[PDB]
Amino acid sequence: HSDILTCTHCQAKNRVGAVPAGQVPSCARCGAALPWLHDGTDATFEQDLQTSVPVLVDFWAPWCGPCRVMGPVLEDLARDLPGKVRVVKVNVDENPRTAARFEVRSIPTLLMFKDGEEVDQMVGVTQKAALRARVEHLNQLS
Numbered sequence: 001h002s003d004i005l006t007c008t009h010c011q012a013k014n015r016v017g018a019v020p021a022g023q024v025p026s027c028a029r030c031g032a033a034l035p036w037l038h039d040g041t042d043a044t045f046e047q048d049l050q051t052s053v054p055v056l057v058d059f060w061a062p063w064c065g066p067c068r069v070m071g072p073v074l075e076d077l078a079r080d081l082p083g084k085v086r087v088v089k090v091n092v093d094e095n096p097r098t099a100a101r102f103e104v105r106s107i108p109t110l111l112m113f114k115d116g117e118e119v120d121q122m123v124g125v126t127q128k129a130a131l132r133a134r135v136e137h138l139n140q141l142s
């Protein structure tokens with residue numbers, strides 16, 4: 001599974017799938033760290049968690065009103081913190097095993113993982129500044 005990550009600096013489209021642990025996606029044209037935001041599936045979820053950077057898993061659905069608001073916020077978060085967070089979007093309509101696994105009840109639900117373990121949970125709309133603060137906090141590496 002692969003997704004296009006667009007470089008903020010030179011505009012290059014970068015098709016990126018699995019990322020070796022210890023590394024973060026970078027632009028193949030100019031070298032800059034990419035905004036690491038992409039779709040995740042039941043099939044890919046365990047691999048999506050195998051990174052060092054904080055992993056922000058966004059359970060969303062087409063019919064969910066607040067998801068239309070939260071999408072752009074997560075997009076800005078990944079752009080502002082390129083390579084310091086991995087945003088994994090999980091369409092619950094299409095990925096029922098992972099939604100059930102984490103006992104998702106409200107849409108949107110945002111879960112934050114660190115080294116494979118759930119470390120935070122945010123139901124409903126969350127301000128981007130609070131998200132940024134929790135991500136930099138986790139980047140202290142704790």
Ligand SMILES: [Zn+2]
Pocket residue numbers: 007008009010011012027028029030031032
């Ligand atoms: Zn670039």
